[PDB]
Amino acid sequence: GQPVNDFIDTATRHVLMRQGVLGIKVKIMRDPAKSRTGPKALPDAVTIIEPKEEEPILAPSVKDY
Amino acid sequence: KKRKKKVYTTPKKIKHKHKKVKLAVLSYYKVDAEGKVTKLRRECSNPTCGAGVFLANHKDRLYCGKCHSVYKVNA
RNA sequence: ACCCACUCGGCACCUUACGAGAAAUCAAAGUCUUUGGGUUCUGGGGGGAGUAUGGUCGCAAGGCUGAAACUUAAAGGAAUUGACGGAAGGGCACCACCAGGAGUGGAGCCUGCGGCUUAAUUUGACCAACACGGGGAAACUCACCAGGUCCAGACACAAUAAGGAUUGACAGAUUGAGAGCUCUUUCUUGAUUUUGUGGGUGGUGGUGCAUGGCCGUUCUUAGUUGGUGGAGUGAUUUGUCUGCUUAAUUGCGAUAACGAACGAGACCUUAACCUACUAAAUAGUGGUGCUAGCAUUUGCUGGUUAUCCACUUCUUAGAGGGACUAUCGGUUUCAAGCCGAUGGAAGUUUGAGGCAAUAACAGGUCUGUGAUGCCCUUAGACGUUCUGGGCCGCACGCGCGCUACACUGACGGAGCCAGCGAGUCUAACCUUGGCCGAGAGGUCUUGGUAAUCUUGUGAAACUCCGUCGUGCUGGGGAUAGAGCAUUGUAAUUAUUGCUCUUCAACGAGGAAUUCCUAGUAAGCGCAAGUCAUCAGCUUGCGUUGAUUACGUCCCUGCCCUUUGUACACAC
């Protein structure tokens, strides 16, 4: 999927050894939370804001002015 | 693809080697008992030939050798 | 007779092993390296071989007893993972089938492959090779063949060398050649070279079974893997599962596992909706708006931000919205889901793609590479160039295709509508218009570096009217003759186009066998790639648009589970 194009970078290098050629492939997945371009998280990652629910009150009141 | 030995139906052809003429320029000048020098060959009428190009003598032509021009005796 | 509670003796059974075992398993197969209750019989790797011979019993068949020579590195046991099964169970796939459609295999031709031939007819590849190598080759490409040039022999050393190491050349011979290739007489040049030895350099030379990278396939399926814990001496196993559900290892759940990761999904691109936003002379529309044309109660038009004023429905593209199976009904054991209707642009994952795990294959490629190891060659070169030929050759066999067998048609006239593209000054690219020509084409200009021009790409099937009239016929257009053009240095072994003439097989194609479930099959053309010319090829695009089935496991295969195995190079 597209997060490969977003967060994966790869590179391939040929290595000249005395017996032949060795292929090297490096694949790095950076942390989505960093960087300042594009998306900051994976498509399926969901975060829920904590409600910060308070206690209920019993006496109606008015703060007039 | 398998290669075979290369046979030739014609004999080998030897490459040209430069002809070695020892002290060629002496036969291009003459001096008398006094000392005056003169040339034994004419020169190229073309300006970019050289005043000492010494047109060669052949059977029925004069050959430059640098300009590759051919002149004649009767002009 | 039955019931309850005991008891001795017996056939057994269930659970668990404290114990034992190589394990399977075992209540004895335990009380066995902590090794001794009593006793009988049997074995000493596999074969030869329960054979030969002798004895003995038997009517016989044969029984009992029973070698050696020789040969051999395993044979064998119990389990584990896989693979396989004309084994079982549950799912699934038009590269399977069913119901069908369109065919192919039959004809001619085009093209690739083998074979044959040849100087060579270069070569790789044999579901997952065979219009494939983007492989539509006149030269080039090119790797093959007949010949001819050059060094593009770095660098070092030795040798030669300004008393010239070396370079080139007019003309003739020679040569396919106006290659001074090499000669025949002689000029030029001047340490740049030449000779030898080391060393390099190049190679479409070999090896893809030495390699990298890429690609294909296994496998279009749903599969895969740590940590910690549990089981096992162990290989290994569980997690990763009975059931239901899903396209899905997708979920509901169940649970010696818990929590995770990859893959699937999510994602991205594209197609369909938006009378809602922001606009636009490179997109359009309206204005008895301006000007003018034709026909008469006003319709159709021509120039319109460059001859104006408005607007964004259509077109464009940024930002967004929109579907989440929504609502309702039914059904499942609540649940995950599934079915139907309604509403909706859209209710198969909304359609189609892109991306895509682990482990592999001696799969393909050394002929994409200044990616490359090793081997071979390296000046009479397998390097690099030039000319010519070949790759296309033809008793024959095969694969992908094109054109057809006609009246649901051929021909003629008329009607007359797309979408995806591409295009030149780093020069001759896309070409409107005018003229000539029967055509193909030629010629003078023109616009376009492009939502601007080609171009509304006025495409073709298609529609109407007419001729033909069931006759291999005006179906079909192979083969062949003559001429005229274009591209290119070169068209012969016909590059292609055009004109006239000849008018073959073929009357729907045996055994067989391919693809496909909706804007899909099929018919029809168009643009791009290739490209100087050549498209019967491919990659896309639109125009017209069915039948049949919403299924099954019969065939061919795929996934999971159980089971058997003497397979593991894995039927």
| C-alpha radius of gyration, chain A, whole number | 27
Q: Which residue has the tokens 């960087």?
A: A35
Is there a contact between B46 and B57 (Cβ–Cβ < 8 Å)?
Answer: no
Q: Which residue has the tokens 């046979």?
A: B7
Cα–Cα distance measured from residue B11 to residue B23, given in angstroms and rounded to the nearest whole number: 35
Find the Å distance, CA of residue B40 to C1' of nucleotide C289.
Answer: 102
Window B31-50, strand C contacts by Cβ < 7 Å = 41, 50
Q: Residue B71, class by beta-carbon neighbours within 10 Å (0-12 exposed, 13-18 middle, 19+ buried)?
A: middle
**Residue-wise DSSP of B14-60:** PPP-----TTGGGGGEEE-SS--EEESS---SSGGG-TT---EE-SS
Closest CA to B74 of B55, B54, B60, B59: B60
Contact flag, residue B72 CB and nucleic strand C, below 7 A:
no
Q: What is the dihedral of CA B45, B51, B52, B53, to 10 degrees?
A: -40
Q: Could you count the other beta carbons within 10 Å of the beta carbon of residue B20?
A: 6
Q: What is the dihedral of CA A42, A48, A49, A50, to 10 degrees?
A: -140
Q: Could you count the other beta carbons within 10 Å of the beta carbon of residue B58?
A: 9
User: Which residues is B38 bridged to in the sheet?
Assistant: B30
Is there a contact between B65 and B52 (Cβ–Cβ < 8 Å)?
Answer: no
Structure tokens at B39: 């040339």
A12: helix, coil or strand? strand
Is there a contact between A32 and A42 (Cβ–Cβ < 8 Å)?
Answer: yes
